[PDB]
């Protein structure tokens, strides 16, 4: 149920996920386990690469009451616009936060948990979270937008924390 979330510097976090070939009962089980992991870790999104599953699967819920489940299988970014940024954290980079430039608005297509295609226009927090999770699927972390020295400071603090 609660899968293991990988933390930097694990090279598995740099792996590029393959597309899901068929949305079947196995894929639906992965989706459900990813939500259970996400909520147990108090996250608002989770990408399959963070749990060592090399498939293009994202789960998101930005709601306070944890009752608004968004599933993005094989997501495609169609359009983006504007610029914004907030202090982002990442379950794979424990206890670190930094402001990251992001598009303010995104338009995406994906498959839902039933395999049905849909299109979503998002802004604000949801748009930011979508970009953060899509980055995970191509081996990209928010710290990659930062300077090399800030990246090394992040890497050493996470390592300190993990060595406990």
- Taking CB positions, which residue lies at the least distance from ligand VLK? 89
Instruction: Tell me which of ligand VLK, Zn ion, none is bound by residue 75, counting a contact when its beta carbon lies within the kind-specific cut-off of 5 to 8 angstroms.
Output: none
Integer CA distances (angstroms), 20 to 55, 65, 88, 126, in order: 6, 29, 27, 23
Least distance from ligand VLK to the Cβ atom of residue 125, Å: 7
Go through 105-125 and write b for each residue having 16 or more CB atoms within 10 A of its CB, e for each that does not. bbbbebbebeeeeeebebeee
Q: Which of 51, 90, 111, 137 binds Zn ion (CB under 5 A)?
A: 90
Q: Is 89 in the site for ligand VLK (CB under 6 A)?
A: yes
Angle 162-96-7 (CA atoms, 0-180°, nearest 5)? 40
Q: Active-site residues: which are they?
A: 133
Binding string, residues 25-64; x marks residues near ligand VLK by CB under 6 A: -----------------xxxxxx--x--------------
For ligand VLK, the closer CB: 45 or 75: 45
- Quick one: which of 86, 39, 85 has its CA closest to 59? 39
- Asked whether the beta carbons of 15 and 54 are under 8 A apart, the reply is yes
For ligand VLK, the closer CB: 114 or 162: 162
- Residue 71, classed as helix, strand or coil, is strand
**What residue ranges bind ligand VLK (CB under 6 A)?**
42-47, 50, 88-92, 128-129, 132-133, 136
């Amino acid at each position: 149920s609660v899968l293991q979330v990988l933390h930097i510097p694990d090279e598995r976090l740099r792996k590029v996920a393959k597309p899901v070939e068929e949305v079947n009962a196995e894929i639906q089980r992965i989706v459900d386990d990813m939500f259970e992991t996400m909520y147990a870790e108090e996250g608002i999104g989770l990408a399959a690469t963070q749990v060592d599953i090399h498939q293009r699967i994202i789960v998101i819920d930005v709601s306070e009451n944890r009752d608004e489940r968004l599933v993005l299988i094989n997501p495609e970014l169609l359009e983006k616009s504007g610029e914004t940024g907030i202090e982002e954290g990442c379950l794979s980079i424990p206890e670190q936060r930094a402001l990251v430039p992001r598009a303010e608005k995104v338009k995406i297509r994906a498959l839902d948990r039933d395999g049905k295609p849909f299109e979503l226009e998002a802004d604000g927090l949801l748009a930011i979270c979508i970009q953060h999770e899509m980055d995970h699927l191509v081996g990209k972390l928010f710290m990659d937008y930062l300077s090399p020295l800030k990246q090394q400071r992040i890497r050493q603090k996470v390592e300190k924390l993990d060595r406990l």
